[PDB]
Write a protein that binds this ligand. Structure first.
Ligand SMILES: CC(C)C[C@H](CC(=O)NO)C(=O)N[C@H](C(=O)N[C@@H](C)C(=O)NCCN)C(C)(C)C
Ligand SMILES: [Zn+2]
Length: 255
């Protein structure tokens, strides 16, 4: 359906994001995330995934959750919104893969109702990481990315969906730029949409500075200073195209 062209999102701002990006203000936090998703959406909507008319596909916020305080946790338990980081309390942040997995566990019920769930946090993941996301696929039985397609979890007694990704706006002990934060989320969502990383070489999927620079699925974060930086490469387009055409009827909605 040119009609079923929108991937509805559950956007979650944890207590950390609320505090450090939102000024402890619900209005400020909300507005930041509404505006960033809208800027990301401009990128997606204007992309012609088949280099022709397969365009107008993007993202909309369906629900926003602002977690104003950390989740109180009993000894031995864990929650993605807890005060301490996991597994190592001394670090500024969680292990990123474990936080993505934890997020997907704790928000499973709400994630089952949307196309994708995305966590916005403010924590300095080790070694320069900015975000993470499960990769989508056109495969019928695909577990990952767009469209909730359950994994049963013995421990929780319920269905969990890997239709999730996360973005941190802290890196290297600073708040990243607004243009950088848009590129993180674009990139993570891009995975959810079916894209892998752009490779270097003959493929034309990682151009030189003189030709517009790298595309948004480059594995090494693009600056956002170059022309291609906010766009999707051909490698990304082939992958996402295949995914959207197979999954849009299943879980995309009207804008
Ligand atoms: C938005 C970016 C593209 C996300 C990826 C991680 C990723 O691939 N997730 O989906 C990233 O963090 N790249 C990091 C990165 O590129 N970060 C930067 C800012 C970089 O630290 N370069 C600094 C090295 N002197 C890595 C893991 C490669 C260090
Ligand atoms: Zn990536």
């Amino acid at each position: 359906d040119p009609m079923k062209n929108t991937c509805k999102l559950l956007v979650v701002a944890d207590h950390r994001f609320y505090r450090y990006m939102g000024r402890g203000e619900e209005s400020t936090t909300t507005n930041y995330l509404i505006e960033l998703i809208d800027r990301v959406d401009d990128i997606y909507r204007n992309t012609a995934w088949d280099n022709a008319g397969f365009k107008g596909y993007g993202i909309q916020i369906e629900q926003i959750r602002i977690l104003k305080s950390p989740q109180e946790v009993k000894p031995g338990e864990k929650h993605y919104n807890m005060a301490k980081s996991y597994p190592n309390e001394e670090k500024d942040a969680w292990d990123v893969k474990m936080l993505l997995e934890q997020f997907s566990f704790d928000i499973a019920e709400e994630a089952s109702k949307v196309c994708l769930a995305h966590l916005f946090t403010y924590q300095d993941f080790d070694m320069g990481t900015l975000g993470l996301a499960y990769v989508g696929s056109p495969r019928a039985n695909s577990h990952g990315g767009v469209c909730p397609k359950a994994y049963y979890s013995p421990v929780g007694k319920k269905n969990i969906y890997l239709n999730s990704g996360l973005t941190s706006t802290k890196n290297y002990g600073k708040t990243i730029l607004t243009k950088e934060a848009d590129l993180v989320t674009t990139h993570e969502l891009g995975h959810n949409f079916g894209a892998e990383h752009d490779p270097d070489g003959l493929a034309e999927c990682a151009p030189n500075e003189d030709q517009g620079g790298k595309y948004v699925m480059y594995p090494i974060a693009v600056s956002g200073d170059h022309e291609n930086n906010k766009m999707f490469s051909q490698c990304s387009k082939q992958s996402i195209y295949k995914t959207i055409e197979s999954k849009a009827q299943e879980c995309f909605q009207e804008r």
